[PDB]
Amino acid sequence: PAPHGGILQDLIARDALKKNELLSEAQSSDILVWNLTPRQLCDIELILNGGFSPLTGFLNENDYSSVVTDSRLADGTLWTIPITLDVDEAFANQIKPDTRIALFQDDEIPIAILTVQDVYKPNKTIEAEKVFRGDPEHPAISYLFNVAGDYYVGGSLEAIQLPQHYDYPGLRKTPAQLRLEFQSRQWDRVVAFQTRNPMHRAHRELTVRAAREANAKVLIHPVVGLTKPGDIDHHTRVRVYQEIIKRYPNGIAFLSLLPLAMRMSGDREAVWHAIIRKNYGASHFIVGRDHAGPGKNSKGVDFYGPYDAQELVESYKHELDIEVVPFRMVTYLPDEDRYAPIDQIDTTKTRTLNISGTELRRRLRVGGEIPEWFSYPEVVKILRESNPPRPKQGFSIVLGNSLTVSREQLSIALLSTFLQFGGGRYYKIFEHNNKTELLSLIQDFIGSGSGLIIPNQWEDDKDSVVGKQNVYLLDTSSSADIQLESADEPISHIVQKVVLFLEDNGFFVF
Amino acid sequence: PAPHGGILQDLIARDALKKNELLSEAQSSDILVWNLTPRQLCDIELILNGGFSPLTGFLNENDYSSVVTDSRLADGTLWTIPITLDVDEAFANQIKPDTRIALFQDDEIPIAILTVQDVYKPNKTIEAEKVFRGDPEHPAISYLFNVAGDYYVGGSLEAIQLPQHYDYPGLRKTPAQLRLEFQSRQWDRVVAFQTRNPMHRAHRELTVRAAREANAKVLIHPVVGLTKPGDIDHHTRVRVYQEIIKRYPNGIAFLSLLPLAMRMSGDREAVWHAIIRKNYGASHFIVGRDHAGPGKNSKGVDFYGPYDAQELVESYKHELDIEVVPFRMVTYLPDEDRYAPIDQIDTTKTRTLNISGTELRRRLRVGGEIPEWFSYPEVVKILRESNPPRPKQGFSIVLGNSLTVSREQLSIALLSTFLQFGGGRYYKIFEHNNKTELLSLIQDFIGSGSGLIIPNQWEDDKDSVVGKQNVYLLDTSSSADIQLESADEPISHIVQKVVLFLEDNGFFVF
Amino acid sequence: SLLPLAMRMSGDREAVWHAIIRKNYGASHFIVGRDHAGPGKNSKGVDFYGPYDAQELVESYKHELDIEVVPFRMVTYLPDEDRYAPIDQIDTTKTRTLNISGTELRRRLRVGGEIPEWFSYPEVVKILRESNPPRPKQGFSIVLGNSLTVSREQLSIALLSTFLQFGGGRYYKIFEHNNKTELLSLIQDFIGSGSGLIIPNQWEDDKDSVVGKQNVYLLDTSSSADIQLESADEPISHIVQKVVLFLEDNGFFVF
Ligand SMILES: Nc1ncnc2c1ncn2[C@@H]1O[C@H](COP(=O)(O)OS(=O)(=O)O)[C@@H](O)[C@H]1O
Ligand SMILES: Nc1ncnc2c1ncn2[C@@H]1O[C@H](COP(=O)(O)OS(=O)(=O)O)[C@@H](O)[C@H]1O
Ligand SMILES: Nc1ncnc2c1ncn2[C@@H]1O[C@H](COP(=O)(O)OS(=O)(=O)O)[C@@H](O)[C@H]1O
């Protein structure tokens, strides 16, 4: 289909002969420089390559507010997610309209030149409520208030080069390249499948059914840009996709990585996704249950209805110009060994089965066996390998402030004790001295599977530098993960308490 | 047999009623304090429990030189290894005879009170040559010149408590306790087996043969104090021993950990070992091939003859008062599936087999399969787990000084590249800033299995803070582990070079 | 078809006899391989018959046997080609063979050794191992020698309790025979059943014939004792360790 807006805005192609000139202006000591934030790098790449056609820069206030209140650009073009360049007051104050800024990656690689159209201070509450539905726990809203700059800079781009990536060089196909890919193959019907999770059996069936319904080839188009916090890293997912792609009949599917930065914005994002895939050459786009939805909030309520995206996408149907293949909860059928849309069964006459991602983590974290029917073995293997069960996980024991015994001796006692268990885990008494350069390493070790014995707490002003993950507090306090009887409880007693606690939580298995 | 010298010098027992008093003197602000070095902690423990009977303190010059030149204490008592309290000039100068010093552990636990007899400055070259045979590579000699103090303090001890241990509380039996153990069992004939390595099939057969020959029970008496540099840690070995002990017939063997600090002194040490085992209640002591020998030097020559220890022990036979069970190279017999002393076979008529420890490390480092006949499976499992094959080992790539490319970008490239391989390894760009508190952590990560990308070298004055292990230098220099074509070689080129190098050395397997 | 013949292990003569018998039974051909009906070698290592005497004898009566004989030379294994073949149509060193004599076959059967996939079918080896178990599943007897000076009652109990702690499915029993042949004749039955017997006293030499020597060991100071004692009054724990290690050495116990 025609790219959204009618013209693929591949600015790398457009500005090619200006490459050298733009590069010189980018490195000239007089120009103002902004180092792109991670999410911005994702966005900037989708704007420069045509993925966000018709966009050609970051939204000015006029287009931005139109998108917030109208799900459309100022000119009426259907567009649901605001793409802006968020900066801080300091930087915002050094720019005026007509100014030209150099956009860098890693304060070293010049990406593009942005020509300023305006500098405004968005009402984050409105954006949060009109675009992401208001819940403070919604991922997009948390980013907007805790990570995003309080100033937006609308303006047009002139491309120097897409953001730098040293991984999967062959796979991050640009809209132009994908289209060429489909052509060399004479693929004129392609149904794209969005995703941010590893694909399991349900999804393989889901995508093949779509392939069959639409009479089209399959495009696994996963996000490797930025997804829901706590998601499986894209490296692991890529390995999973590459593995599962082999279970498709020869020549039916194509894999391409999309450096998109999701907002986990349910229905609106679904619309945005469809526009994006259309630019990339797809003729069909799947929209299953709770598409781009972040599940439930701490209170158990849904951020979006499991089918809000489908309804919204349906309502813009006549102007999306890319056919949407909707799917209802695809689930497992024990008694018949096969999956099927829940909309075409049940009646109690048929018994289903469904292993939610929740419980999926649970078995991964507990070395539990994951059903042959649920996911392919090679896939589960890759997953366990990246997310090991507790007996292979790292952790830390922090000797609480209330601790009266010799921290030096209690430390050694724990070390020598853990050491006798064996099991390949590396242990260390780790003294941080409140130096963030040391604190920031704590999660590295835990990530590496090591067990750390930390003799002292770190000041509360530093608590943010340390990832709470697998970090237990040994103390008399009620807020201690491992509660002691008294601050001066004898070492061997404290030791047994720590060991049995770790054993209870699966870190040790005898 | 009677402890060496006739009287078990169990000073803990002896000084019991002085415990409180000694403890008070030890913590009095007026007394001079020396914090025991690791090896000293091992020695002090064998002196206070009777293990070094007839010793009751650290050798004064008179006894010390008699041991060096006569293999005997000043009074004639057979004794081959000098046990001295080595200190630095600074401390040496603060003491005179009659002075009482408090000996602490971890500058916190008071171990004993040493009454000074003399303070001398040993000629380390004579000790090195007469006691350890002079080769600068010999482990004991290296310790003597690079770790030992240049001053010795002779003097008698008064025990407060044996050095503190939090691991294997039940297993570190003292001479008094072992003897009771043997008695409760009515064991009056016990052959002890010394060792610093994991026990394999040969050893199990070797010890049972000795049990059969001597008509005695088996005592596995492994060293967990200090051994040959690069040995398997004692925790792993203890797990190996506890596992292999089950392969003995019910009630034929007993396990006990010996906190001895070996000197790897071949024949002399064997004499010393036999004296120590006699104090511990043994009636027989095994002395196999190259007992307590450190193998060969860099030039390939032997530190000791494979049977020097046997000859030396044989010559003191009538005064050791503990029977020695000598063994020649025990080897494997394929065609008959059984082991046997090489002295009772060969003639070419029989074909043998022998997997040296060398080649044993090799398979352990290469994930190679280790023969069913060589060692029990449960044992190899424990070993592989403590010494994983390369694909599970950590490492560091240090961006050489000669590097002209962007270190920041080359670092990222390697990170992203390694990230796509997967396999459970944790990666990190690690900036040390020449701070030893960071440098000293490099080997911790490697130990934890992580891969580190280090953008800059550390100043030569710090090089000693970092363990050379699995640390590779990427540079144009000839001394670079991974040699670059030019200092400005393009990143993808450098990356492929680093990846293929690591693949070639087994860190990556596809 | 099962033939209730009583062989004489008479090499060549028997082969002639066998061929006559097979002819009566309806056969038109009879095979005569290497050392047919031969009992191998005597204690001095010499052959009772030449490996092909039977073939020669059968060949000489060929015209009156009236049953055709199919002769075969040593059929052996060919590693490199995975196949068997008559030795008469190979060798020349150009080809390497392989041959697991019955001797060595018993050896592995008695030592739980693995018997080559090429040598015999698995289902067959299974049936054999099951009828002729390896040592760790075999029975045996320890006979307390005459020279024994220690309490036979206490030494018996000690060995019983000791063996009992090893476990492994073997049944144990202190077995008093009282020189009664009705009891002696049962000794091999238990051994056959896999049990371990502790026998406090020897049986009079006139009865020795009633007992099968198989897996029966003599614990004594004598030189003819299978398990030799230092002195007739060696302390029990010492004697016990000696008996345990001896049995361990001969595979009856595996830890
Ligand atoms: N069981 C299912 N039934 C129907 N659709 C599904 C099912 N599971 C996943 N999908 C669809 O698969 C696509 C990607 O799934 P996910 O990776 O879990 O999350 S999403 O944030 O990208 O939507 C979405 O269209 C989603 O609705
Ligand atoms: N193959 C062997 N043949 C004879 N003796 C051996 C053999 N292997 C090890 N030993 C003996 O086993 C004891 C301990 O072995 P090791 O742990 O390797 O080394 S040692 O440093 O404690 O001597 C020594 O008496 C040694 O000589
Ligand atoms: N390897 C062999 N090569 C040739 N003939 C063999 C071989 N093995 C067994 N035979 C033959 O097989 C027949 C029966 O073999 P056996 O049961 O071992 O012994 S026999 O006592 O009945 O002759 C005989 O004709 C014997 O010569």
Ligand SMILES: [O-][Cl+2]([O-])[O-]
């Ligand atoms: O299905 Cl993934 O969440 O593991």
Ligand SMILES: [O-][Cl+2]([O-])[O-]
């Ligand atoms: O025997 Cl050890 O060297 O592994």
Ligand SMILES: [O-][Cl+2]([O-])[O-]
């Ligand atoms: O001797 Cl038989 O072939 O077992």
Ligand SMILES: [Ca+2]
């Ligand atoms: Ca703000």
Ligand SMILES: [Ca+2]
């Ligand atoms: Ca719901």
Ligand SMILES: [Ca+2]
């Ligand atoms: Ca108290």
Ligand SMILES: [Ca+2]
């Ligand atoms: Ca010095």
Ligand SMILES: [Ca+2]
């Ligand atoms: Ca040699």
Ligand SMILES: [Ca+2]
């Ligand atoms: Ca150059």
Ligand SMILES: [Ca+2]
């Ligand atoms: Ca012959």
Ligand SMILES: [Ca+2]
């Ligand atoms: Ca006697």
Ligand SMILES: [Mg+2]
């Ligand atoms: Mg890119």
Ligand SMILES: [Mg+2]
């Ligand atoms: Mg101790």
Ligand code: NA
């Ligand atoms: Na920089």
Ligand code: NA
């Ligand atoms: Na509001």
Ligand code: NA
């Ligand atoms: Na259609």
